[PDB]
Design a protein around this ligand. Structure first.
Ligand code: HEM
Ligand code: HEM
Ligand code: HEM
Ligand code: HEM
Lengths: 144, 142, 142, 145
């Protein structure tokens, strides 16, 4: 993948305007609610049995914050995303046997929560670069 | 299928956002063609696809008119949208992957414009509804 | 939705292959597990999952009993498969990508076993039918 | 992707046994019938009105044969598949703008027609190796996306 100087700035700008403690739990909560088969991967995380419970669940919250920190590493090393996510791909796509369709679903929930937080600043061009970044990440998480 | 709960949720959200439908549709269509530019080829017969295109603005209104029709036909989307399916699925041969892309772009825009109405609960019901709309539009493929 | 043409095509095909349902189910299930090993974890409570093993053979027959139920309920798959949906979509939380995988393996095994019967027309009708079965099994996710 | 000697032999045997002039047109015709939005990418290929039309269409048939010869390139260079399909990836993305989800659908149609041709010799372990190969091919085809 090739990245422009503006694209790197744009990704850096998006993530710097977020509070990961805010966005992380929102994104993962939404994924577990809207695409609830993904709960099958979070059995040891406590109460998942209705939306209120998921939204209040601080173990789910902590994990969503972990996801944002994991994306931050990519924000930081945009030309090597496939490599730094090497181990996470094995985790997800080998140890946990997560179908990769689901990586897209979580990325879509993140986009939706990022758009609500940023409002009008999340303009179409910003979304385009954000989605190009997430597609790289999703692929990297992908098998092999 | 949509439950009474989903249908109430969708009717309620639409009643709150339909006054901005023109803008929702322009924003959503605009995002589809920039963020997922493989979709541009479907509209290449119009003279302008650039940001702020009049054709994009006009068609965004048209698309949200189709959403308004679907909300009124929420109890039988297949029948309600049969004519739109013959156009999309049979005449235009739209890739159904793109129905999911536009549905996502519509959710992104409603989230952005109406963050306090777009709860996780509103989200799951509206995504079930857009999935049913997409399935209804796929009625005449094969 | 299934047209009357599609329903006729599925019923005729089923009339020709149903005597082989045990074998179809064993081969199909065996292939989902070994060709798409991400599905193995749904069945890890059985130790031998090699093709044709006792548990695979037995569950293969169970699966095809669900398909024969769907053929009998072909005019309303969602109502017909509601209990099976509660089991798969809610209690077991099967990923819906896997419904597509088992559907594909059923079509591969029918094509292998009945090449003359499995015409391109039979294929599109039975795939519409398995898509309808998969959506019916997805009824209780959310 | 790494390969064992047996996987290499298996792929060679599956494709070695096929008449590409028979299998190619069937695989592609079935994709155009069962997944008919894919017809949007074949606008210069003549009649795609219905199943009879597609199956009788010799432009479609010739193209299906070309697809199998293209796969043959990967069969004969199983360690270089990403490299050998880089141009084809660009073709499918930049000329046609085909959603990569559709590559899996044509591969699925190929598997169904191969299964009918090959019979029970297409046993589950043989299908597992074939799907592995086709996944590497589909991943190579979406890489330039
Ligand atoms: C595509 C975007 C995703 C990103 C960037 C991502 C990132 C992360 C990271 C950074 C971790 C922590 C690794 C560790 O500390 O060992 C993690 C763990 C995990 N992920 Fe994801 N993930 C994604 C999608 C998903 C999806 C869609 C699911 C399942 C539906 C999933 C399920 C899990 C589970 C179950 C674990 C932790 C295992 C445990 O603690 O039991 N992830 N992920
Ligand atoms: C799934 C949600 C969608 C809805 C509710 C929707 C709605 C509509 C409506 C109301 C029309 C006008 C029909 C007429 O009277 O001519 C239309 C036309 C059209 N739509 Fe969509 N649409 C959807 C998705 C898509 C997608 C995903 C694409 C392609 C990427 C698309 C491509 C087109 C095209 C090319 C036309 C005709 C434009 C022309 O007039 O030349 N639609 N759609
Ligand atoms: C065509 C789609 C499928 C059909 C018709 C089907 C049919 C059935 C039937 C009839 C049962 C038995 C119900 C009972 O126990 O009362 C069953 C159980 C089960 N199904 Fe499926 N199924 C489908 C897809 C799947 C898939 C894709 C998976 C996972 C990859 C799956 C996993 C299971 C499991 C884990 C059980 C319970 C086995 C046990 O008794 O321990 N099913 N299915
Ligand atoms: C496994 C997936 C696929 C493989 C291996 C494959 C392979 C090929 C090959 C080898 C060619 C060029 C043949 C030659 O000129 O010698 C080609 C071209 C083409 N493919 Fe595919 N293809 C795949 C999927 C698809 C799909 C899913 C579509 C449509 C939805 C498609 C549409 C086309 C078209 C229209 C051309 C002609 C483009 C041109 O040169 O003008 N292909 N493909």
């Amino acid at each position: 993948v090739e990245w422009t100087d503006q694209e790197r700035a744009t990704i850096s700008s998006i993530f710097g305007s977020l509070d990961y403690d805010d966005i992380g739990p929102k994104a993962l909560s939404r994924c577990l609610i809207v695409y609830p088969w993904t709960q099958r991967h979070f059995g040891s995380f406590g109460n998942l049995y209705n939306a209120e419970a998921i939204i209040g669940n601080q173990k789910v919250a902590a994990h969503g914050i972990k996801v944002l920190h994991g994306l931050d590493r990519a924000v930081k090393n945009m030309d090597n995303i496939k490599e730094i996510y090497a181990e996470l791909s094995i985790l997800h796509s080998e140890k946990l046997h997560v179908d990769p369709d689901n990586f897209k679903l979580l990325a879509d929930c993140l986009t939706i929560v990022v758009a609500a937080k940023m409002g009008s600043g999340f303009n179409p061009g910003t979304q385009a670069t954000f989605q190009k970044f997430l597609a790289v990440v999703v692929s990297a998480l992908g098998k092999q | 299928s949509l439950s009474d709960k989903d249908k109430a949720a969708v009717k309620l959200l639409w009643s709150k956002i339909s006054k901005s439908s023109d803008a929702i549709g322009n924003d959503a269509l605009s995002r589809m063609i920039v963020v997922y530019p493989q979709t541009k080829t479907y509209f290449a017969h119009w003279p302008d696809l650039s940001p702020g295109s009049p054709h994009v603005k006009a068609h965004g209104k048209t698309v949200m008119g189709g959403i308004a029709l679907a909300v009124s036909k929420i109890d039988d989307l297949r029948a309600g949208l049969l004519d739109l399916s013959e156009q999309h699925a049979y005449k235009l041969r739209v890739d159904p992957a793109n129905f999911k892309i536009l549905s996502h772009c519509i959710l992104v825009v409603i989230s952005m414009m109406f963050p306090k109405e777009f709860t996780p609960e509103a989200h799951v019901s509206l995504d079930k509804f857009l999935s049913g709309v997409s399935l209804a539009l796929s009625e005449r493929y094969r």
